[PDB]
Amino acid sequence: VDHCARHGEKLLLFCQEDSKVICWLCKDSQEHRGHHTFLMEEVAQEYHVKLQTALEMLRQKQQEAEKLEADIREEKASWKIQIDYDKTNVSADFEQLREILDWEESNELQNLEKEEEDILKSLTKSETEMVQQTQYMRELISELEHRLQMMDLLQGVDGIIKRIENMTLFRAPDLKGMLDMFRDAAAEESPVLLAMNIFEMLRIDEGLRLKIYKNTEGYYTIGIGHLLTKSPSLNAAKSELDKAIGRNTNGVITKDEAEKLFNQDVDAAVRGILRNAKLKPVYDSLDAVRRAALINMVFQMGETGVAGFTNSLRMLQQKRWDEAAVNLAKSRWYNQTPNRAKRVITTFRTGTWDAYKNL
Amino acid sequence: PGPEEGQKVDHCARHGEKLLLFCQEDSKVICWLCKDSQEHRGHHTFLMEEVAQEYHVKLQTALEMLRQKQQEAEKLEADIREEKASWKIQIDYDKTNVSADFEQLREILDWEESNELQNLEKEEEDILKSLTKSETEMVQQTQYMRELISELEHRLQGSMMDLLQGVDGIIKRIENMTLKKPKTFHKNQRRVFRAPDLMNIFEMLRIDEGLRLKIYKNTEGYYTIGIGHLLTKSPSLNAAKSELDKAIGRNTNGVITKDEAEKLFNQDVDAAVRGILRNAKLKPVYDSLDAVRRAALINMVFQMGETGVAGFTNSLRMLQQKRWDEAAVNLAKSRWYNQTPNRAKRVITTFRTGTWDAYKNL
Numbered sequence: 001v002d003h004c005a006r007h008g009e010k011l012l013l014f015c016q017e018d019s020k021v022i023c024w025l026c027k028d029s030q031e032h033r034g035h036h037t038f039l040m041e042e043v044a045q046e047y048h049v050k051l052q053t054a055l056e057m058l059r060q061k062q063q064e065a066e067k068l069e070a071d072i073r074e075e076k077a078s079w080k081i082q083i084d085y086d087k088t089n090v091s092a093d094f095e096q097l098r099e100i101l102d103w104e105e106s107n108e109l110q111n112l113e114k115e116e117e118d119i120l121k122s123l124t125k126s127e128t129e130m131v132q133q134t135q136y137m138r139e140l141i142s143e144l145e146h147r148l149q150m151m152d153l154l155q156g157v158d159g160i161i162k163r164i165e166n167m168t169l170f171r172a173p174d175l176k177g178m179l180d181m182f183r184d185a186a187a188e189e190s191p192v193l194l195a196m197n198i199f200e201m202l203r204i205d206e207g208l209r210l211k212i213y214k215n216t217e218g219y220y221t222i223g224i225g226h227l228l229t230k231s232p233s234l235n236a237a238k239s240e241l242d243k244a245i246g247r248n249t250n251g252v253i254t255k256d257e258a259e260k261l262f263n264q265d266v267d268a269a270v271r272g273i274l275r276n277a278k279l280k281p282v283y284d285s286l287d288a289v290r291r292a293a294l295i296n297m298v299f300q301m302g303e304t305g306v307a308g309f310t311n312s313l314r315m316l317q318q319k320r321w322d323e324a325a326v327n328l329a330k331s332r333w334y335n336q337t338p339n340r341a342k343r344v345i346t347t348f349r350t351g352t353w354d355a356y357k358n359l
Numbered sequence: 360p361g362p363e364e365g366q367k368v369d370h371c372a373r374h375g376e377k378l379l380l381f382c383q384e385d386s387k388v389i390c391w392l393c394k395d396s397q398e399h400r401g402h403h404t405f406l407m408e409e410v411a412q413e414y415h416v417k418l419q420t421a422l423e424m425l426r427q428k429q430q431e432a433e434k435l436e437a438d439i440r441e442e443k444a445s446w447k448i449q450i451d452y453d454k455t456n457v458s459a460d461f462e463q464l465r466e467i468l469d470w471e472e473s474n475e476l477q478n479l480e481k482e483e484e485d486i487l488k489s490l491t492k493s494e495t496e497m498v499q500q501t502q503y504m505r506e507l508i509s510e511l512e513h514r515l516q517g518s519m520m521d522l523l524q525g526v527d528g529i530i531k532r533i534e535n536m537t538l539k540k541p542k543t544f545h546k547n548q549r550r551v552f553r554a555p556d557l558m559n560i561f562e563m564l565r566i567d568e569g570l571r572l573k574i575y576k577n578t579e580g581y582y583t584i585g586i587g588h589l590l591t592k593s594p595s596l597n598a599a600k601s602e603l604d605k606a607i608g609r610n611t612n613g614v615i616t617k618d619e620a621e622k623l624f625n626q627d628v629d630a631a632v633r634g635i636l637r638n639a640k641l642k643p644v645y646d647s648l649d650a651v652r653r654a655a656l657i658n659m660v661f662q663m664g665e666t667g668v669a670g671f672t673n674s675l676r677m678l679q680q681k682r683w684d685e686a687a688v689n690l691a692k693s694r695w696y697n698q699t700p701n702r703a704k705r706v707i708t709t710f711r712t713g714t715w716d717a718y719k720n721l
């Protein structure tokens with residue numbers, strides 16, 4: 001049950017090298033000569049602590065590894081959208097080319113229908129003209145024919161002698177060529193749908209500011225738009241900061257810390273959405289480029305404040321884009337921060353970072 | 360009234376005496392008292408009869424000139440009407456020609472688009488391959504550690520021996536821990552394209568059939584060429600240009616030469632003589648007719664075919680009975696006469712008169 005395998009004795013020792021448990025008879029052998037040993041109790045309670053610490057770190061890395069799972073789980077599904085957009089974009093693009101050809105067709109055709117108007121109008125004119133010149137001839141033949149048959153054929157004839165004596169009568173360019181020119185290159189750049197994130201979003205929307213400033217609303221705030229306190233006391237806001245950073249900041253911080261707060265503010269907001277019953281369903285419904293836009297509206301005016309946009313939360317889940325943009329503009333949130341709301345909407349609209357590529 | 364006499368003579372309105380004199384120099388007619396008026400006091404007067412046939416001749420000699428100057432005028436009447444349809448063709452050929460080039464291009468797009476989607480699908484396959492790999496390379500890490508943890512969780516409990524046996528290898532491997540990261544394509548270069556921001560037989564026929572070197576419409580709306588050479592009865596132009604090349608033996612592009620026009624003309628006439636001699640309805644007639652009427656017969660078989668002309672029983676019966684007076688009437692009462700009266704007159708004339716009086720003017 002608990003004895004040395006072979007020697008049949010009590011396992012008391014612990015070789016440092018082998019790191020395995022042995023008995024005193026095991027010690028006097030090949031694999032344990034020159035080896036330092038100890039009794040199990042002399043090393044036990046020390047090792048116990050050593051794994052009590054290994055466990056804790058090993059548990060954090062089990063969270064970090066469970067993030068890398070999610071991380072690429074998102075990227076897969078993201079490309080699925082990236083592709084199934086570049087696809088429509090690429091197709092619809094050609095569709096417009098297929099249109100400009102349809103116009104240029106009937107255009108060039110009516111330029112030939114114009115020649116069938118011009119040359120055809122000089123036709124019926126010089127037709128009727130020389131068609132009477134034919135019957136007017138039968139008018140004189142029938143005349144003389146009955147003029148003959150004396151009173152008839154003489155009533156002025158040396159005039160008709162003078163009458164008869166004066167009877168005078170491709171658009172097609174190398175389209176393949178141009179497409180071969182543009183197919184070459186123009187600007188080979190990174191993706192245009194996941195070359196940015198919720199972080200770079202808010203970095204642009206909130207800016208990074210190291211020393212305490214006042215809000216859009218007037219309140220004290222720091223770093224990547226982290227609210228400190230509604231109070232007018234700069235010190236009180238310094239106090240909250242001092243308390244928030246875990247040192248004596250004095251209303252100014254490192255960028256490294258400015259980031260920490262931001263990661264937390266983001267991540268804290270997210271948990272606010274996962275717990276709120278009205279928000280989450282809309283989150284899971286949207287693509288990444290919009291999943292971030294919800295965090296933005298939450299990061300700004302908090303959980304309870306976004307849940308109120310029920311009229312807007314409906315369309316976006318039903319995915320009526322151009323309309324959800326107009327309904328959000330009627331909320332006070334648009335009135336107060338016009339440019340910010342505009343950028344977030346345009347992102348709820350286009351489903352792209354196009355509202356940010358400027359900045 | 361009276362026959363073999365002269366019509367009564369009217370009277371000089373200004374004087375009263377009969378109008379009998381032809382004033383030379385004034386070309387008009389007057390009485391004797393009118394010769395004394397100052398209007399003529401110097402003009403050589405003559406009796407109407409003394410000059411009647413001088414002028415009756417002079418008008419006939421002039422009247423014939425009028426008819427022959429009426430033909431060349433009626434020929435320039437058709438000279439225009441021909442050019443009319445000669446452009447109506449030129450357009451309805453350039454019209455289809457362009458709309459066939461605008462299709463060569465729409466084809467070019469279809470293929471380019473096909474080539475572009477065929478690429479956005481290679482990316483998706485390629486990327487969603489390495490991803491679904493490294494993905495499991497993470498399902499490994501996450502699950503693995505959940506088992507590497509359970510090891511410790513097991514040691515931190517139970518026997519001191521369990522806690523201790525081979526414990527170093529673990530605090531080694533855990534200190535030497537570095538979770539790898541997934542193969543992201545977050546920012547690797549890429550390209551999705553940009554749509555840019557944009558007499559006998561042959562002669563008699565040419566007069567009636569004409570000579571065009573390109574595809575023109577018949578007297579019945581069918582595409583023909585040369586001298587009445589039917590390519591097709593279909594209203595398609597592309598259908599004419601296709602059969603045309605099977606005929607000529609080259610790509611004409613809607614235009615042949617004069618020796619190619621005559622090539623297909625001698626193949627049509629040489630068949631008309633056959634179409635008749637191969638027919639037990641017409642051959643009895645063709646043999647019992649002289650050279651001129653034989654042409655008038657071949658003209659009808661060339662115009663309609665051996666089956667069509669063989670539809671004229673009474674006429675062919677009478678032309679065999681040689682009843683010209685009766686036959687010329689039976690050929691007029693026909694759809695052949697209505698569709699082309701001018702040509703019908705010329706053929707029926709060739710049957711009745713037995714001469715070429717129907718082409719001395721054309």
Ligand SMILES: [Zn+2]
Nearest residue numbers: 004007023026
């Ligand atoms: Zn032992």
Ligand SMILES: [Zn+2]
Nearest residue numbers: 015018032035
């Ligand atoms: Zn040992």
Ligand SMILES: [Zn+2]
Nearest residue numbers: 371374390393
């Ligand atoms: Zn008189």
Ligand SMILES: [Zn+2]
Nearest residue numbers: 382385399402
């Ligand atoms: Zn006179």
